Amino acid sequence: SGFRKMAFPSGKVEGCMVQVTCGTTTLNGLWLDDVVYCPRHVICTSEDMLNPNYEDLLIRKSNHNFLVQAGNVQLRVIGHSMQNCVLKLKVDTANPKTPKYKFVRIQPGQTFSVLACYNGSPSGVYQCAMRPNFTIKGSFLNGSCGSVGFNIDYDCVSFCYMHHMELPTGVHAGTDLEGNFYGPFVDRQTAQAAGTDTTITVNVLAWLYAAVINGDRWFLNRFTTTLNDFNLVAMKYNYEPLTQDHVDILGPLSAQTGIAVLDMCASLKELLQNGMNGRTILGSALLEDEFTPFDVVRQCSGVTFQ
Amino acid sequence: SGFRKMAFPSGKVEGCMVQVTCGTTTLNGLWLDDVVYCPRHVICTSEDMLNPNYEDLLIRKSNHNFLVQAGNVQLRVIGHSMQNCVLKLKVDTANPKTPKYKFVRIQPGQTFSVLACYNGSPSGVYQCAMRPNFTIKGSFLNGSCGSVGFNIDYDCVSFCYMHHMELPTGVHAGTDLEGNFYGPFVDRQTAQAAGTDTTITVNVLAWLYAAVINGDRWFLNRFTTTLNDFNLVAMKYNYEPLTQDHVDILGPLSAQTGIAVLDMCASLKELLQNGMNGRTILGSALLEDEFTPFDVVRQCSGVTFQ
Numbered sequence A, B: 001s002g003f004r005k006m007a008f009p010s011g012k013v014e015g016c017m018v019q020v021t022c023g024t025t026t027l028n029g030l031w032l033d034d035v036v037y038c039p040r041h042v043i044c045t046s047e048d049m050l051n052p053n054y055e056d057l058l059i060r061k062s063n064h065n066f067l068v069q070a071g072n073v074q075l076r077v078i079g080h081s082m083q084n085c086v087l088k089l090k091v092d093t094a095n096p097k098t099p100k101y102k103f104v105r106i107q108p109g110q111t112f113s114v115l116a117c118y119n120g121s122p123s124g125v126y127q128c129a130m131r132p133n134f135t136i137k138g139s140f141l142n143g144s145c146g147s148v149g150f151n152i153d154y155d156c157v158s159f160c161y162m163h164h165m166e167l168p169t170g171v172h173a174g175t176d177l178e179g180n181f182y183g184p185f186v187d188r189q190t191a192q193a194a195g196t197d198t199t200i201t202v203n204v205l206a207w208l209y210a211a212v213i214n215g216d217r218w219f220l221n222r223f224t225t226t227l228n229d230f231n232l233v234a235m236k237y238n239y240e241p242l243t244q245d246h247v248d249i250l251g252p253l254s255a256q257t258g259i260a261v262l263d264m265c266a267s268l269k270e271l272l273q274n275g276m277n278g279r280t281i282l283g284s285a286l287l288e289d290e291f292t293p294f295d296v297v298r299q300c301s302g303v304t305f306q
């Protein structure tokens, strides 16, 4: 028993992190097969970040201007190209520690583990959710760009995030591994607004099911509700509306606990209107939305990986 | 910026986890050099767990009764012994992935990362604190025994915890790597009481300093207090008393933020008596005590490892 915000084991990703230097800036890169992936703003000076013309800046660079280092081993760049907002550096050596992997573009509300790195070396690992407004609330300092987010399925590492920037509001933005930003952001040092952030309702419900599984049941009430009635209350409190796909995904948790999805919504509705009254759920005084239904099943069933 | 409950990268530990079978029970083991470490109750049946005579049970076992497996590689046990509550299995092969390591017995209030494992395979990693009553509030299912807790310093893995049991209250107990339990517990399936759990005050203060560093300043007040005056309030709310050693440890955080330790205590005193009034600190509606002063410095300065 117990419930924790646990990350994936990071071993398979630690072997893929390298340091990338171009001119004076040094960032992290991801080394898979004989290609290194890194944010394209590694080719910028501090002055270029206000209004960078990436095509014109990349022209002035040659293969021997990039220094890629894996610990003490040095890689030789034999070809470079720009794909959207990432740089792809072809190197002469294929990474012997390359795991089974794929590139995935996740949806808002999905969760992943971030391996925070500095100078190509791992600092720590934590779990987080892609917000509905396509930001993440991470923990990143100067030099962490190029750190990656990932999931593990079976023996396969699915890379889904590369860190590119901190917004003036202190939240974080980045791209998939094909270099397409999540959200309406651009890799430029300019004030950029993120939209309204909402709470991920299907995740909150998954967490209430986790709480029931672990013995927190005080919030279960006698009422029930309808989907339309619940969504009316949810939108007043800036919660994402629940759809039928969300009800389908919660099916297994409903089966295991014997609590129908709509009955759980009625409990949540009462928590939204009445608060928690100084009580806690799974050791928290706020409603938690960084666990997907799959995260709950995985943690409460003991799923392992390669 | 940002602040997260981040764990250490687990790669160096993933390469040390093995599966240990003796009779019908299968647990996790830790393979360093040519020795495997695992909980001694691997030699018990379900009936033996009520009142096990470990010496008499270990007599009936021979080297060829232990099956140790590292993925698909099979280790041959050539010698076994019992050190307190752990079994030490000598094997014919030395682990080629053995990192620089040491065994450490931590103190209550210190934090570490747990690599939760099942059948010798990693499931996830999370950070937690040793409670003042020598339990941990982890996330463990049947079969997780033998999972280890660890810290990383420089290039050295310090192992400090091996998981042995879940108490009837749903909290967890275990040993150091020499097999001495933390706390007054015994490896027997009997009702065992843990003492009163208190809040780790020096950790709460470290977290308030983290909050100031990241922009949460609303809780700073005009008052100050004395050490004796604060400890009187703290003990009424089941907080550990603050000593001079704790003030010394918080020194660097005081220097960085310009807020004296005693001034921060006065802010905390007001939070204890008046609550938080529906406000949050670093995204939490409760006072958090699972970050040590060192954890804050490490996260807010970007410390990396091998």
Ligand SMILES: *CC(=O)N1N=C(c2ccccc2)C[C@H]1c1ccc(OC)c(OC)c1
Binding pocket: A025, A026, A027, A041, A049, A141, A142, A143, A144, A145, A146, A163, A164, A165, A166, A187, A188, A189, A190
């Ligand atoms: C994340 C990261 O390392 N960096 N992000 C940068 C950026 C700035 C504005 C807009 C988009 C992206 C630049 C880069 C960076 C690296 C290192 C330092 O200090 C050593 C930086 O200081 C601000 C920035």
Ligand SMILES: *CC(=O)N1N=C(c2ccccc2)C[C@H]1c1ccc(OC)c(OC)c1
Binding pocket: B025, B026, B027, B041, B049, B141, B142, B143, B144, B145, B146, B163, B164, B165, B166, B187, B188, B189, B190
């Ligand atoms: C942690 C763990 O795996 N186990 N802890 C056990 C224990 C029980 C009572 C007192 C102290 C320690 C036994 C062991 C265990 C392994 C596997 C299963 O199911 C497959 C168990 O089921 C209860 C227990």
